Protein backbone atom coordinates (compact mmCIF):
# COMPACT_ATOMS: atom_id res chain seq x y z
CA UNK A 1 0.00 0.00 0.00
CA UNK A 2 1.46 3.33 -1.17
CA UNK A 3 0.01 5.19 1.76
CA UNK A 4 1.56 2.82 4.31
CA UNK A 5 5.03 3.31 2.83
CA UNK A 6 4.63 7.04 3.33
CA UNK A 7 3.31 6.92 6.78
CA UNK A 8 6.31 4.87 7.95
CA UNK A 9 8.67 7.40 6.37
CA UNK A 10 7.10 10.37 8.05
CA UNK A 11 7.04 8.58 11.32
CA UNK A 12 10.87 8.49 11.33
CA UNK A 13 13.90 10.72 11.92
CA UNK A 14 16.44 12.58 9.82
CA UNK A 15 19.16 15.25 10.00
CA UNK A 16 18.93 18.32 7.80
CA UNK A 17 21.99 20.49 7.24
CA UNK A 18 21.26 23.88 8.75
CA UNK A 19 23.31 26.95 9.53
CA UNK A 20 23.32 26.32 13.25
CA UNK A 21 24.62 22.90 12.66
CA UNK A 22 27.38 23.85 10.29
CA UNK A 23 28.50 26.65 12.60
CA UNK A 24 29.02 24.27 15.47
CA UNK A 25 30.89 21.72 13.42
CA UNK A 26 33.49 24.28 12.41
CA UNK A 27 33.73 25.73 15.91
CA UNK A 28 34.35 22.38 17.50
CA UNK A 29 37.01 21.62 14.97
CA UNK A 30 38.84 24.68 15.94
CA UNK A 31 38.65 23.50 19.46
CA UNK A 32 39.67 20.04 18.63
CA UNK A 33 42.99 20.86 17.10
CA UNK A 34 43.68 23.57 19.59
CA UNK A 35 42.89 21.01 22.22
CA UNK A 36 40.81 23.44 24.26
CA UNK A 37 37.69 22.72 26.46
CA UNK A 38 34.49 24.73 26.07
CA UNK A 39 30.76 24.49 26.50
CA UNK A 40 27.67 24.70 24.32
CA UNK A 41 24.58 26.42 25.69
CA UNK A 42 21.09 27.19 24.50
CA UNK A 43 17.37 26.61 25.07
CA UNK A 44 16.01 23.09 25.30
CA UNK A 45 14.47 22.76 21.83
CA UNK A 46 17.25 24.23 19.70
CA UNK A 47 18.56 20.83 18.65
CA UNK A 48 21.89 20.82 20.46
CA UNK A 49 21.95 17.06 21.01
CA UNK A 50 21.37 16.36 17.31
CA UNK A 51 24.11 18.68 16.02
CA UNK A 52 26.57 16.87 18.37
CA UNK A 53 25.60 13.42 16.94
CA UNK A 54 25.84 14.79 13.43
CA UNK A 55 29.34 15.76 14.38
CA UNK A 56 30.30 12.46 15.96
CA UNK A 57 29.32 10.59 12.83
CA UNK A 58 31.61 12.50 10.54
CA UNK A 59 34.66 11.01 12.29
CA UNK A 60 34.48 7.24 12.25
CA UNK A 61 36.69 5.24 14.61
CA UNK A 62 39.57 3.56 12.81
CA UNK A 63 40.79 -0.03 13.09
CA UNK A 64 44.00 -1.93 12.45
CA UNK A 65 44.53 -5.66 12.76
CA UNK A 66 45.73 -5.66 16.35
CA UNK A 67 45.43 -2.66 18.66
CA UNK A 68 42.26 -0.94 20.01
CA UNK A 69 40.19 1.40 17.80
CA UNK A 70 41.49 4.87 17.36
CA UNK A 71 38.65 7.09 18.56
CA UNK A 72 39.10 10.82 18.04
CA UNK A 73 35.71 11.78 19.56
CA UNK A 74 33.92 10.25 22.56
CA UNK A 75 30.27 11.15 23.23
CA UNK A 76 28.50 10.20 26.46
CA UNK A 77 25.28 11.05 28.29
CA UNK A 78 25.22 10.67 32.10
CA UNK A 79 22.35 9.32 34.27
CA UNK A 80 20.82 11.43 37.09
CA UNK A 81 23.03 12.11 40.17
CA UNK A 82 26.02 10.73 38.19
CA UNK A 83 28.91 9.87 40.51
CA UNK A 84 32.63 9.42 39.91
CA UNK A 85 32.25 5.79 39.16
CA UNK A 86 29.45 6.36 36.68
CA UNK A 87 31.44 8.66 34.54
CA UNK A 88 34.37 6.35 34.26
CA UNK A 89 32.17 3.37 33.70
CA UNK A 90 30.46 5.03 30.69
CA UNK A 91 33.80 6.29 29.20
CA UNK A 92 35.23 2.73 29.47
CA UNK A 93 32.11 1.09 27.88
CA UNK A 94 32.03 3.62 25.16
CA UNK A 95 35.44 2.48 24.05
CA UNK A 96 34.30 -1.12 24.30
CA UNK A 97 36.13 -2.39 27.33
CA UNK A 98 34.32 -4.40 29.98
CA UNK A 99 34.14 -2.96 33.45
CA UNK A 100 34.69 -5.32 36.37
CA UNK A 101 34.43 -5.07 40.16
CA UNK A 102 36.99 -2.83 41.93
CA UNK A 103 37.17 0.46 43.90
CA UNK A 104 37.26 4.17 42.81
CA UNK A 105 40.92 4.36 42.31
CA UNK A 106 40.70 1.46 39.99
CA UNK A 107 38.12 2.90 37.70
CA UNK A 108 40.27 6.05 37.52
CA UNK A 109 43.56 4.38 36.79
CA UNK A 110 41.85 2.22 34.12
CA UNK A 111 40.09 5.16 32.52
CA UNK A 112 43.34 6.97 32.06
CA UNK A 113 44.89 3.82 30.47
CA UNK A 114 42.10 3.40 27.88
CA UNK A 115 42.09 7.16 27.12
CA UNK A 116 45.82 6.72 26.38
CA UNK A 117 47.00 4.53 23.51
CA UNK A 118 43.62 4.87 21.93
CA UNK A 119 43.90 8.27 20.30
CA UNK A 120 41.24 10.43 21.92
CA UNK A 121 41.07 14.11 21.13
CA UNK A 122 37.64 15.23 22.36
CA UNK A 123 35.12 14.20 25.03
CA UNK A 124 31.54 15.54 24.74
CA UNK A 125 29.27 15.47 27.78
CA UNK A 126 25.58 15.95 27.12
CA UNK A 127 23.20 17.18 29.82
CA UNK A 128 26.27 18.12 31.82
CA UNK A 129 24.23 19.22 34.80
CA UNK A 130 23.41 15.67 35.74
CA UNK A 131 26.93 15.48 37.15
CA UNK A 132 27.26 15.52 40.91
CA UNK A 133 29.35 18.46 42.05
CA UNK A 134 32.38 16.44 42.99
CA UNK A 135 32.74 14.77 39.63
CA UNK A 136 33.89 17.91 38.07
CA UNK A 137 37.18 17.30 39.81
CA UNK A 138 37.65 14.27 37.58
CA UNK A 139 36.49 16.10 34.46
CA UNK A 140 39.02 18.90 35.03
CA UNK A 141 41.74 16.41 35.90
CA UNK A 142 41.45 14.62 32.58
CA UNK A 143 41.24 17.82 30.59
CA UNK A 144 44.41 19.14 32.19
CA UNK A 145 46.45 15.85 32.38
CA UNK A 146 45.67 14.49 28.85
CA UNK A 147 45.54 16.51 25.63
CA UNK A 148 41.82 16.01 25.50
CA UNK A 149 39.31 18.77 24.87
CA UNK A 150 36.18 18.41 26.95
CA UNK A 151 32.93 19.95 25.78
CA UNK A 152 30.01 20.50 28.16
CA UNK A 153 26.58 20.75 26.52
CA UNK A 154 23.47 22.10 28.23
CA UNK A 155 20.62 24.57 29.08
CA UNK A 156 20.87 27.87 31.08
CA UNK A 157 20.56 25.90 34.22
CA UNK A 158 23.99 24.47 33.54
CA UNK A 159 25.51 27.82 34.03
CA UNK A 160 23.63 28.31 37.20
CA UNK A 161 25.32 25.18 38.44
CA UNK A 162 28.73 26.08 37.09
CA UNK A 163 28.80 29.53 38.69
CA UNK A 164 28.81 27.81 42.03
CA UNK A 165 32.46 26.91 41.51
CA UNK A 166 35.20 29.11 40.30
CA UNK A 167 37.50 26.26 39.52
CA UNK A 168 35.22 24.92 36.86
CA UNK A 169 33.80 28.06 35.49
CA UNK A 170 37.27 29.13 34.44
CA UNK A 171 38.39 26.05 32.62
CA UNK A 172 35.13 26.13 30.65
CA UNK A 173 34.67 29.85 30.15
CA UNK A 174 34.48 29.87 26.33
CA UNK A 175 31.13 28.96 24.84
CA UNK A 176 28.95 28.87 21.76
CA UNK A 177 25.25 29.70 21.95
CA UNK A 178 22.34 28.24 19.98
CA UNK A 179 19.43 30.57 19.32
CA UNK A 180 15.93 30.62 17.90
CA UNK A 181 14.71 31.04 14.30
CA UNK A 182 13.32 34.29 12.99
CA UNK A 183 12.58 36.45 10.00
CA UNK A 184 14.06 35.13 6.79
CA UNK A 185 15.72 32.27 8.58
CA UNK A 186 12.57 30.85 9.96
CA UNK A 187 10.89 31.29 6.57
CA UNK A 188 13.71 29.67 4.53
CA UNK A 189 13.76 26.74 7.04
CA UNK A 190 10.08 26.17 6.64
CA UNK A 191 10.56 26.07 2.92
CA UNK A 192 13.50 23.71 3.24
CA UNK A 193 11.39 21.40 5.35
CA UNK A 194 8.66 21.34 2.89
CA UNK A 195 10.83 20.38 -0.08
CA UNK A 196 13.41 18.34 1.76
CA UNK A 197 11.32 16.54 4.43
CA UNK A 198 7.56 16.52 3.69
CA UNK A 199 7.44 16.10 -0.10
CA UNK A 200 3.75 15.93 -0.69
CA UNK A 201 2.78 16.10 -4.33
CA UNK A 202 0.59 19.08 -4.00
CA UNK A 203 3.17 21.64 -2.66
CA UNK A 204 1.62 23.40 0.25
CA UNK A 205 3.19 26.88 -0.02
CA UNK A 206 3.86 27.25 3.61
CA UNK A 207 6.08 30.22 3.04
CA UNK A 208 2.94 32.13 2.23
CA UNK A 209 1.88 34.72 4.71
CA UNK A 210 -1.33 32.95 5.67
CA UNK A 211 0.55 29.85 6.73
CA UNK A 212 3.55 31.41 8.30
CA UNK A 213 1.31 33.14 10.78
CA UNK A 214 0.02 29.81 11.85
CA UNK A 215 3.46 28.26 12.22
CA UNK A 216 5.05 31.25 13.83
CA UNK A 217 2.53 31.34 16.61
CA UNK A 218 2.62 27.57 16.91
CA UNK A 219 6.42 27.15 16.97
CA UNK A 220 7.94 30.37 18.39
CA UNK A 221 11.13 29.69 16.42
CA UNK A 222 12.17 26.38 17.91
CA UNK A 223 13.32 23.86 15.37
CA UNK A 224 11.87 21.13 17.60
CA UNK A 225 8.36 22.36 17.42
CA UNK A 226 8.56 23.11 13.77
CA UNK A 227 9.45 19.59 12.97
CA UNK A 228 6.88 18.00 15.21
CA UNK A 229 4.14 20.15 13.99
CA UNK A 230 4.67 19.70 10.28
CA UNK A 231 5.09 16.00 10.58
CA UNK A 232 1.93 15.59 12.69
CA UNK A 233 0.14 17.76 10.07
CA UNK A 234 1.28 15.81 7.00
CA UNK A 235 0.57 12.43 8.63
CA UNK A 236 -2.95 13.38 9.77
CA UNK A 237 -3.61 14.97 6.44
CA UNK A 238 -2.63 11.92 4.43
CA UNK A 239 -4.74 9.59 6.40
CA UNK A 240 -7.69 11.64 5.11
CA UNK A 241 -6.65 11.45 1.47
CA UNK A 242 -5.29 14.96 0.99
CA UNK A 243 -2.09 15.76 -0.90
CA UNK A 244 -1.28 19.12 0.67
CA UNK A 245 -1.32 20.92 4.04
CA UNK A 246 -4.15 23.47 4.13
CA UNK A 247 -5.06 26.15 6.65
CA UNK A 248 -7.67 24.34 8.71
CA UNK A 249 -5.82 21.01 9.18
CA UNK A 250 -2.63 22.82 10.35
CA UNK A 251 -4.71 24.95 12.80
CA UNK A 252 -6.40 21.71 14.01
CA UNK A 253 -2.88 20.41 14.96
CA UNK A 254 -1.49 23.76 16.23
CA UNK A 255 -4.52 24.21 18.59
CA UNK A 256 -3.40 21.02 20.46
CA UNK A 257 -0.08 22.69 21.45
CA UNK B 1 17.28 -41.05 5.88
CA UNK B 2 18.67 -38.02 4.00
CA UNK B 3 17.18 -35.62 6.48
CA UNK B 4 18.77 -37.35 9.49
CA UNK B 5 22.22 -37.33 7.88
CA UNK B 6 22.05 -33.57 7.47
CA UNK B 7 20.78 -32.74 10.84
CA UNK B 8 23.72 -34.55 12.46
CA UNK B 9 26.11 -32.46 10.38
CA UNK B 10 24.53 -29.19 11.31
CA UNK B 11 24.75 -30.10 14.92
CA UNK B 12 28.57 -30.22 14.60
CA UNK B 13 31.57 -27.88 14.47
CA UNK B 14 34.09 -26.52 11.99
CA UNK B 15 36.87 -23.96 11.59
CA UNK B 16 36.54 -21.15 9.08
CA UNK B 17 39.61 -19.09 8.33
CA UNK B 18 38.24 -15.71 9.28
CA UNK B 19 40.12 -12.49 9.04
CA UNK B 20 40.57 -12.26 12.76
CA UNK B 21 42.18 -15.67 12.95
CA UNK B 22 44.81 -15.02 10.37
CA UNK B 23 46.31 -12.21 12.30
CA UNK B 24 46.84 -14.11 15.55
CA UNK B 25 48.62 -16.92 13.78
CA UNK B 26 51.21 -14.56 12.35
CA UNK B 27 51.61 -12.63 15.60
CA UNK B 28 52.24 -15.74 17.62
CA UNK B 29 54.76 -16.89 15.09
CA UNK B 30 56.70 -13.78 15.59
CA UNK B 31 56.59 -14.46 19.25
CA UNK B 32 57.53 -18.01 18.88
CA UNK B 33 60.82 -17.53 17.15
CA UNK B 34 61.65 -14.52 19.22
CA UNK B 35 60.88 -16.69 22.19
CA UNK B 36 58.94 -13.97 23.99
CA UNK B 37 55.89 -14.31 26.36
CA UNK B 38 52.73 -12.27 25.78
CA UNK B 39 49.02 -12.32 26.38
CA UNK B 40 45.84 -12.31 24.30
CA UNK B 41 42.74 -10.48 25.48
CA UNK B 42 39.21 -9.96 24.28
CA UNK B 43 35.52 -10.53 25.00
CA UNK B 44 34.27 -14.04 25.70
CA UNK B 45 32.44 -14.67 22.42
CA UNK B 46 35.14 -13.53 20.02
CA UNK B 47 36.41 -17.05 19.42
CA UNK B 48 39.79 -16.79 21.13
CA UNK B 49 39.81 -20.45 22.18
CA UNK B 50 39.18 -21.58 18.60
CA UNK B 51 41.78 -19.34 16.94
CA UNK B 52 44.40 -20.62 19.46
CA UNK B 53 43.28 -24.28 18.94
CA UNK B 54 43.40 -23.95 15.18
CA UNK B 55 46.94 -22.74 15.63
CA UNK B 56 47.98 -25.69 17.76
CA UNK B 57 46.93 -28.08 15.02
CA UNK B 58 49.02 -26.50 12.34
CA UNK B 59 52.18 -27.82 14.03
CA UNK B 60 51.95 -31.58 14.31
CA UNK B 61 54.20 -33.21 16.91
CA UNK B 62 57.13 -34.93 15.24
CA UNK B 63 58.64 -38.40 15.67
CA UNK B 64 61.90 -40.09 14.80
CA UNK B 65 62.79 -43.72 15.37
CA UNK B 66 64.66 -43.16 18.62
CA UNK B 67 64.07 -40.27 21.01
CA UNK B 68 60.80 -38.92 22.52
CA UNK B 69 58.37 -36.81 20.45
CA UNK B 70 59.35 -33.27 19.75
CA UNK B 71 56.40 -31.06 20.64
CA UNK B 72 56.79 -27.41 19.65
CA UNK B 73 53.45 -26.19 21.10
CA UNK B 74 51.62 -27.19 24.30
CA UNK B 75 48.00 -26.12 24.84
CA UNK B 76 46.36 -26.58 28.25
CA UNK B 77 43.23 -25.40 30.06
CA UNK B 78 43.18 -25.04 33.87
CA UNK B 79 40.32 -25.88 36.30
CA UNK B 80 38.82 -23.20 38.61
CA UNK B 81 41.07 -22.12 41.53
CA UNK B 82 43.93 -24.05 39.82
CA UNK B 83 46.76 -24.70 42.27
CA UNK B 84 50.49 -25.18 41.76
CA UNK B 85 50.14 -28.89 41.65
CA UNK B 86 47.39 -28.80 39.06
CA UNK B 87 49.37 -26.94 36.51
CA UNK B 88 52.24 -29.34 36.52
CA UNK B 89 49.97 -32.33 36.46
CA UNK B 90 48.21 -31.06 33.29
CA UNK B 91 51.55 -30.19 31.53
CA UNK B 92 52.87 -33.72 32.34
CA UNK B 93 49.66 -35.44 31.04
CA UNK B 94 49.60 -33.32 28.00
CA UNK B 95 52.95 -34.71 27.11
CA UNK B 96 51.76 -38.28 27.57
CA UNK B 97 53.87 -39.25 30.58
CA UNK B 98 52.26 -39.82 33.93
CA UNK B 99 53.83 -39.65 37.26
CA UNK B 100 51.62 -40.46 40.13
CA UNK B 101 52.15 -39.86 43.79
CA UNK B 102 54.64 -37.52 45.34
CA UNK B 103 54.68 -33.93 46.70
CA UNK B 104 54.74 -30.51 44.91
CA UNK B 105 58.42 -30.34 44.60
CA UNK B 106 58.32 -33.59 42.81
CA UNK B 107 55.84 -32.54 40.22
CA UNK B 108 58.05 -29.50 39.54
CA UNK B 109 61.25 -31.41 39.08
CA UNK B 110 59.47 -33.79 36.65
CA UNK B 111 57.88 -30.96 34.69
CA UNK B 112 61.22 -29.43 33.96
CA UNK B 113 62.54 -32.84 32.78
CA UNK B 114 59.69 -33.40 30.27
CA UNK B 115 59.80 -29.77 29.05
CA UNK B 116 63.56 -30.22 28.45
CA UNK B 117 64.91 -32.63 25.84
CA UNK B 118 61.54 -32.73 24.21
CA UNK B 119 61.65 -29.52 22.21
CA UNK B 120 58.96 -27.18 23.48
CA UNK B 121 58.83 -23.66 22.16
CA UNK B 122 55.45 -22.32 23.33
CA UNK B 123 53.00 -22.93 26.19
CA UNK B 124 49.43 -21.60 25.82
CA UNK B 125 47.28 -21.20 28.91
CA UNK B 126 43.57 -20.78 28.29
CA UNK B 127 41.34 -18.98 30.77
CA UNK B 128 44.48 -17.79 32.52
CA UNK B 129 42.49 -16.14 35.27
CA UNK B 130 41.50 -19.48 36.67
CA UNK B 131 45.02 -19.57 38.08
CA UNK B 132 45.37 -18.91 41.78
CA UNK B 133 47.58 -15.90 42.40
CA UNK B 134 50.51 -17.87 43.69
CA UNK B 135 50.77 -20.10 40.66
CA UNK B 136 52.14 -17.32 38.64
CA UNK B 137 55.37 -17.90 40.48
CA UNK B 138 55.63 -21.24 38.70
CA UNK B 139 54.56 -19.79 35.36
CA UNK B 140 57.27 -17.10 35.53
CA UNK B 141 59.82 -19.65 36.71
CA UNK B 142 59.36 -21.81 33.62
CA UNK B 143 59.23 -18.83 31.32
CA UNK B 144 62.56 -17.54 32.63
CA UNK B 145 64.32 -20.94 33.20
CA UNK B 146 63.59 -22.54 29.77
CA UNK B 147 63.48 -20.82 26.38
CA UNK B 148 59.75 -21.28 26.26
CA UNK B 149 57.31 -18.56 25.27
CA UNK B 150 54.26 -18.51 27.49
CA UNK B 151 51.02 -17.03 26.21
CA UNK B 152 48.18 -16.06 28.57
CA UNK B 153 44.71 -15.98 26.99
CA UNK B 154 41.67 -14.35 28.57
CA UNK B 155 38.96 -11.68 29.20
CA UNK B 156 39.40 -8.15 30.71
CA UNK B 157 39.40 -9.66 34.11
CA UNK B 158 42.73 -11.26 33.31
CA UNK B 159 44.29 -7.88 33.35
CA UNK B 160 42.65 -7.04 36.58
CA UNK B 161 44.44 -10.04 38.01
CA UNK B 162 47.78 -9.29 36.41
CA UNK B 163 47.93 -5.63 37.45
CA UNK B 164 47.88 -6.65 41.07
CA UNK B 165 51.44 -7.92 40.80
CA UNK B 166 54.38 -6.15 39.34
CA UNK B 167 56.39 -9.27 38.88
CA UNK B 168 53.92 -10.66 36.43
CA UNK B 169 52.82 -7.58 34.68
CA UNK B 170 56.33 -7.06 33.38
CA UNK B 171 57.04 -10.46 31.95
CA UNK B 172 53.69 -10.40 30.15
CA UNK B 173 53.41 -6.76 29.16
CA UNK B 174 52.91 -7.18 25.38
CA UNK B 175 49.44 -8.08 24.21
CA UNK B 176 47.11 -8.58 21.27
CA UNK B 177 43.37 -7.91 21.39
CA UNK B 178 40.50 -9.61 19.56
CA UNK B 179 37.60 -7.46 18.42
CA UNK B 180 34.01 -7.69 17.25
CA UNK B 181 32.42 -7.87 13.80
CA UNK B 182 31.18 -4.73 12.11
CA UNK B 183 30.31 -2.96 8.91
CA UNK B 184 31.54 -4.70 5.79
CA UNK B 185 33.22 -7.36 7.85
CA UNK B 186 30.08 -8.54 9.48
CA UNK B 187 28.39 -8.72 6.08
CA UNK B 188 31.22 -10.65 4.33
CA UNK B 189 31.17 -13.16 7.26
CA UNK B 190 27.48 -13.73 6.95
CA UNK B 191 27.88 -14.50 3.30
CA UNK B 192 30.79 -16.85 3.88
CA UNK B 193 28.81 -18.69 6.51
CA UNK B 194 25.97 -19.31 4.27
CA UNK B 195 28.08 -21.02 1.60
CA UNK B 196 30.72 -22.52 3.82
CA UNK B 197 28.60 -23.82 6.74
CA UNK B 198 24.85 -24.05 5.98
CA UNK B 199 24.82 -25.30 2.38
CA UNK B 200 21.13 -25.58 1.74
CA UNK B 201 20.02 -26.55 -1.73
CA UNK B 202 18.14 -23.34 -2.23
CA UNK B 203 20.01 -20.14 -1.62
CA UNK B 204 18.61 -18.33 1.33
CA UNK B 205 20.38 -15.18 0.24
CA UNK B 206 20.95 -13.40 3.63
CA UNK B 207 23.31 -10.51 2.81
CA UNK B 208 20.16 -8.84 1.61
CA UNK B 209 19.48 -5.58 3.34
CA UNK B 210 16.21 -6.77 4.84
CA UNK B 211 17.76 -9.82 6.46
CA UNK B 212 20.91 -8.31 7.78
CA UNK B 213 18.82 -6.05 9.96
CA UNK B 214 17.49 -9.09 11.67
CA UNK B 215 20.91 -10.62 12.22
CA UNK B 216 22.60 -7.47 13.35
CA UNK B 217 20.11 -6.86 16.09
CA UNK B 218 20.19 -10.52 17.06
CA UNK B 219 23.98 -10.95 17.15
CA UNK B 220 25.51 -7.56 18.08
CA UNK B 221 28.74 -8.52 16.31
CA UNK B 222 29.72 -11.61 18.25
CA UNK B 223 30.80 -14.44 16.02
CA UNK B 224 29.42 -16.80 18.67
CA UNK B 225 25.90 -15.65 18.30
CA UNK B 226 26.07 -15.49 14.57
CA UNK B 227 26.98 -19.08 14.34
CA UNK B 228 24.41 -20.32 16.79
CA UNK B 229 21.69 -18.39 15.21
CA UNK B 230 22.20 -19.51 11.63
CA UNK B 231 22.60 -23.10 12.58
CA UNK B 232 19.48 -23.12 14.79
CA UNK B 233 17.63 -21.57 11.81
CA UNK B 234 18.67 -24.22 9.26
CA UNK B 235 17.96 -27.08 11.69
CA UNK B 236 14.49 -25.84 12.69
CA UNK B 237 13.76 -25.08 9.09
CA UNK B 238 14.68 -28.53 7.84
CA UNK B 239 12.78 -30.32 10.48
CA UNK B 240 9.67 -28.73 8.92
CA UNK B 241 10.57 -29.72 5.37
CA UNK B 242 11.67 -26.35 4.01
CA UNK B 243 14.34 -25.92 1.33
CA UNK B 244 15.72 -22.61 2.60
CA UNK B 245 15.92 -20.16 5.52
CA UNK B 246 13.30 -17.42 5.20
CA UNK B 247 12.48 -14.25 7.12
CA UNK B 248 9.79 -15.59 9.43
CA UNK B 249 11.68 -18.66 10.74
CA UNK B 250 14.82 -16.52 11.34
CA UNK B 251 12.70 -14.04 13.40
CA UNK B 252 11.11 -17.02 15.25
CA UNK B 253 14.66 -18.08 16.35
CA UNK B 254 16.03 -14.53 16.93
CA UNK B 255 12.99 -13.71 19.16
CA UNK B 256 14.29 -16.32 21.68
CA UNK B 257 17.62 -14.43 22.09
Amino acid sequence: EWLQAEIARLKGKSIVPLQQVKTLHDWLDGKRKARKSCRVVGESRTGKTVACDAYRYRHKPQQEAGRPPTVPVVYIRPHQKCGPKDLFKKITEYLKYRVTKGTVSDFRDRTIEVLKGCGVEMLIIDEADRLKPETFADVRDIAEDLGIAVVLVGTDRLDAVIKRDEQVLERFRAHLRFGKLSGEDFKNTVEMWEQMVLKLPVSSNLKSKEMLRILTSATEGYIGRLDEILREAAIRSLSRGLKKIDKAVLQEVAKEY
Amino acid sequence: EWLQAEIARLKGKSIVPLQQVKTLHDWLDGKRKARKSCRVVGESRTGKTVACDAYRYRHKPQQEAGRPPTVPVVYIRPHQKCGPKDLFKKITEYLKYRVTKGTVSDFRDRTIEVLKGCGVEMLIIDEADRLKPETFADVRDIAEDLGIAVVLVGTDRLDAVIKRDEQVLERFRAHLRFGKLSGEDFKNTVEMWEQMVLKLPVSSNLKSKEMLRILTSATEGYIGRLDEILREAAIRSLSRGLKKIDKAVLQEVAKEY
Binding site: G12, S14, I15, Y57, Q62, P69, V197 | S182
Partner: peptide, 14 residues
Protein backbone atom coordinates in the same frame (compact mmCIF):
# COMPACT_ATOMS: atom_id res chain seq x y z
CA UNK C 1 21.49 18.79 -0.76
CA UNK C 2 22.05 15.53 0.99
CA UNK C 3 19.83 14.95 3.96
CA UNK C 4 20.50 11.86 6.07
CA UNK C 5 18.33 9.18 7.41
CA UNK C 6 18.95 8.90 11.09
CA UNK C 7 18.90 5.17 11.30
CA UNK C 8 21.22 4.86 8.33
CA UNK C 9 23.89 6.96 10.00
CA UNK C 10 23.63 4.50 12.82
CA UNK C 11 24.00 1.45 10.59
CA UNK C 12 27.04 2.89 8.87
CA UNK C 13 28.77 3.59 12.20
CA UNK C 14 32.21 2.33 13.20
Amino acid sequence: IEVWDYEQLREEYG
